[model samples]
Target chain A: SMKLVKFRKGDSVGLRLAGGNDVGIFVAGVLEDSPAAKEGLEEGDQILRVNNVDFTNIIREEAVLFLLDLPKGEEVTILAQKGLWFSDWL
Target chain B: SMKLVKFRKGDSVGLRLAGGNDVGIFVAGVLEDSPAAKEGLEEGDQILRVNNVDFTNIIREEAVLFLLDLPKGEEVTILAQKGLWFSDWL
Candidate 1:
């Protein structure tokens, strides 16, 4: 199930993106007690969009650039992939 | 236009609703520097939904019950109507 997560610019999403290819940009890990945790994002969730900008077709570089360019105190909406990524695909 | 505004449980949305009849729940006033202010919610907007629950047809008491039952530190997303409520409707 897709979920919308909100976080301020300076707030740590506490997530790492890796192992993405043709599948999607999956959430690698999440930090404990972090903004990511508070916002209810979990591991293996594919980040689908940010602020209505499509993240599905973009590469890591573009995603990094988009996220890094945001300023402090700005809030963002991130659409994340839901369901079991591995089992659902298989 | 519609926008999703987020705030914590204890955070004041700093809004007052009035002037609704057959129209919708319109924002009457917003407190300066409140969470509502920081989240960019403005006066004269219509509150459409809360956490995916419909506020479209509900009355003020129903809305109040829905809001009051929520516990502390609970984060919520309120879908608010955008555009000039007065100018656009005319």
Candidate 2:
């Protein structure tokens, strides 16, 4: 079966980079009013890892499957890069 | 524009495997009565390269675009694996 994790607006999640580069972190949309959101994750937050796992060269489709494979209600550490912007947003 | 090559059953083409393995060779469908077909290719053929380019872990959608990017009516060498069914198709 092809499993998938659903995400909507207003969640804290990281977006990984492609071509063997360091991941690009984003903290705007992880889930719809998810626990990540309730943890006060705001937009433009850098995601360093998911449950202490460094993500790299991740496929868009496969990432969803990874989330679905996680055990239910499991607390996972999400490491992320946090700055006004990777680019100076001033 | 998303460019794609048209292929149907009964043609010669190769299938690449993921996870850094050597590309899997298949020769069932490349194009419909295409130049490859006219050049005497059959199904179950392993493809090594297209125009001297080795294909590996290619995105399904991106591969379509690559074929479309090829110059029309261009003669290209397609290296492939040729054996009776990487599986025993007897």
Candidate 3:
């Protein structure tokens, strides 16, 4: 099963950087008591999209820029997935 | 800055995979009250290696098998990274 979360952040998105490659942003930590945490964002979830934009193909900085650029208190929708594969080939 | 974590698991490794490609295993969550959590294994870290085997190049299933095959209660060492890239090109 997958989950889509919606929340609002005033300045910082409260997403701590973890390790990521070309696929998606690996969320290392969702700041406690932050918007992300309240929205059910957790550590280890790969951010697939932001506001319906496919972020799986973008770099970390690009994704961060997108989130940071959002106006304060803007409603945000984050598409995230938790598990080994979206569709396992094996 | 980076961190290397070594821990032990009895049965379930307590790692829920998010999406992953050929690069590395995208850790979705570290089960609370598990060995991973006690070892400071957080969410969003990319599992780079196991026992220094360099899992970064292996497939998700391969990595999972390796971990699952480990003897119960065996001391395991995992190399994980939390961030965008190992060495940022830009």
Candidate 4:
């Protein structure tokens, strides 16, 4: 399980898969406009799960597909591992 | 201050305010369809910053306001810190 933190506005991090090796991950992408973006999340970081579930286990596409599939105003968890030594010890 | 990983098709990650203490952070939100979405990123995570800047220092109105202000094809980083023990030591 991952803990939650407050992402400052416009911070860059990582986006990746949960439990999956770090490879083939996209280089950069912004949080656009949404709750995640509003709360703080940045442009580049490794993503991991959603609402508690690892999106990687579902499809090979960014979890956004599933998220976009939900109601426009729906809510979900945005979890990921970031920082230089963040996931290294994991 | 961070690294990148491959977020398979769907992954959830945290979104937070960089440098700011973990309080007043929002929870639950999806990684809508987009490059980051297509790359993985999930929903319901505290937010941080974007494009390398701690948006918390911005207008404080969800960086989306700024992201949405960008051109349609603008490239940006979607960074944030997540995981229980991931950022604790940082």
Candidate 5:
């Protein structure tokens, strides 16, 4: 199941990625006293949504840009799946 | 300038894509008195962003899915360009 977390921003969430293409966005680490660390978001969580946008549908560069462009002081919602893929592939 | 139009949702902005792949999203038509037409967004305009999501980076299918998933009753912000390309190749 996809897990969701909603909170305000605090600098970076320390996102990481895998492979070269067609991969889900991963969280390799989180900063100390950061918003991500405060939430239930743990490392290896595959981000499913960010601010209501489908994180899976977008590419790594686009996702990175979006995360950077995201402004502070606004409520941000993130949906992450824990160590699993949302869909099946052969 | 990349024009921005913000208003409550009425349904859709009549978004249309180009070619088969690697192209920008376009507005082929807009509903009569719809949110798109009322905000000076003419047909053939290229949609740059929608609801804060970049309309250019995602694929056509992904864009289609996002448009369909957008809910109503919220303020929608659309950034559309007037018959121009944001980037050039060759």
Candidate 6:
């Protein structure tokens, strides 16, 4: 398991999976003025779990449900890791 | 100016703003089976512009509209850049 950042948001956590072939949950983008951003969430950060629940191999709809179920305005720990690498220099 | 990648998707493009303070349009996550991914788009890639339209200092809602306005599957070019570095490696 990789070490990552965590935070909470109300209703929308602003995340999505990488692709159908990739199960990694990526923080697509943090909603402006949302708690998710205020908590230092960064775009491209992959969320491994929600409150200790493994987020891998899960459908997007299901993940949404999990995030929505969390209590509003409450702090929820998010296990996330970001893939860091420079693009092919041009 | 920095260099980045570009591509097209249907009505929905997978992307979002980094934060309210940051106007860079980050590729939060490429959707499964999305052409955006097929063109080598990656999570956390910041889109600098759409078809040469500078995206800096723009609103998220307006940016979405600009992406949606592109013709579906017409090979719209996107200028993007990825921020790379070790994540405070633990």
- DockQ, each predicted model: 0.01, 0.01, 0.26, 0.03, 0.01, 0.07
What's the lDDT of the predicted structure labeled candidate 4? 0.36
Question: Can you tell me the CAPRI class of model 2?
Answer: incorrect
Positional deviation of B75 in candidate 4, in angstroms? Answer: 21
Question: lDDT rank, highest first?
Answer: 3, 1, 5, 6, 2, 4
Better of 2 and 3 by TM-score: 3
Between the candidate structures 1 and 3, which one is better when assessed by lDDT? 3
TM-score of 3: 0.55
Off by over 4 Å in 1: A83-90, B1-90
Q: Provide the DockQ value for model 3.
A: 0.26
Cα RMSD for predicted model 3: 6.0
Q: Is the docking of candidate 3 incorrect, acceptable, medium or high quality?
A: acceptable
Which stretch of 10 consecutive residues in model 3 chain A shows the poorest summed lDDT? A81-90
For model 6, residues A1-90, the per-residue Cα lDDT tens digits are 454555655665544433223344555555567666677766556677778688876765666667766776666787766522111111
lDDT of 5 by residue, B11-60 (tens): 55333333123456655435556765687765446778888788888776
**In model 6, what are the clashing residue pairs, if there are any?**
A28-B28, B4-B80, B6-B78
Docking class of 4: incorrect
- What ordering of candidates by TM-score runs from best to worst? 3, 6, 1, 5, 2, 4
| Predicted model with the maximum lDDT | 3
Q: lDDT values of the candidates?
A: 0.61, 0.38, 0.65, 0.36, 0.58, 0.56
Better DockQ candidate (2, 6): 6
Kindly give the stretch of ten consecutive residues in candidate 2 chain A with the minimal lDDT sum. Answer: A81-90
Point to the candidate with the largest DockQ.
3
lDDT of 3 by residue, A1-90 (tens): 478988876677777544444545656557667888888986656777788688767765666667667888988888877722422211
Please provide, for model 1 over A1-90, each residue's C-alpha lDDT reduced to its tens digit, 9 standing for 90 to 100.
889999775644456554323445556445666766789876557788888688878766667666666776778788987611221100
TM-score of chain A of each: 0.77, 0.48, 0.79, 0.49, 0.77, 0.67
Candidate 3 lDDT tens digits, B1-90: 357887776677777654444545656567677888888876556777778577667766667677767887888887777723421211
Show where candidate 4 strays beyond 4 Å.
Answer: A1-27, A31-33, A62-64, A83-90, B1-90
lDDT of 4 at A87: 15
Q: For residues B61-90, what per-residue lDDT tens digits would candidate 6 score against the true structure? A: 667667766666755677777622111101
Instruction: Give lDDT tens digits, candidate 2, residues A1-90.
Output: 111123332222322221112234233233334655555543334444555454434443444445445665556555544411211100
Candidate 4 residues A1-90, lDDT tens each?
343433331222222222123232211233355345565444334455556666446543444345444443345456644421111100
